[PDB]
Amino acid sequence: GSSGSSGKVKELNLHELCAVCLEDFKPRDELGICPCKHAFHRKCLIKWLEVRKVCPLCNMPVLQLAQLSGPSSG
Ligand SMILES: [Zn+2]
Ligand SMILES: [Zn+2]
Helix, strand or coil: CCCCCCCCCCCCCCCCECCCCCCECCCCCCEEEECCCEEEEHHHHHHHHHHCCECCCCCCECCCCCCCCCCCCC
């Protein structure tokens, strides 16, 4: 964990924080958006998907993309 509130900190407050790692999302790292209106770290997701092929937020089974994006289905 983190403990040591000290020094001047200037980090715009937001209402969006990862669920797997629980760390303020950063632009430097790519963000993957899910069909459940939930975004996560390209790493957090990929990994979390291995141990649990579900969303750590809504907890919905995301195996196949229902939406008709491309003929890459079959
Ligand atoms: Zn994360
Ligand atoms: Zn979700």
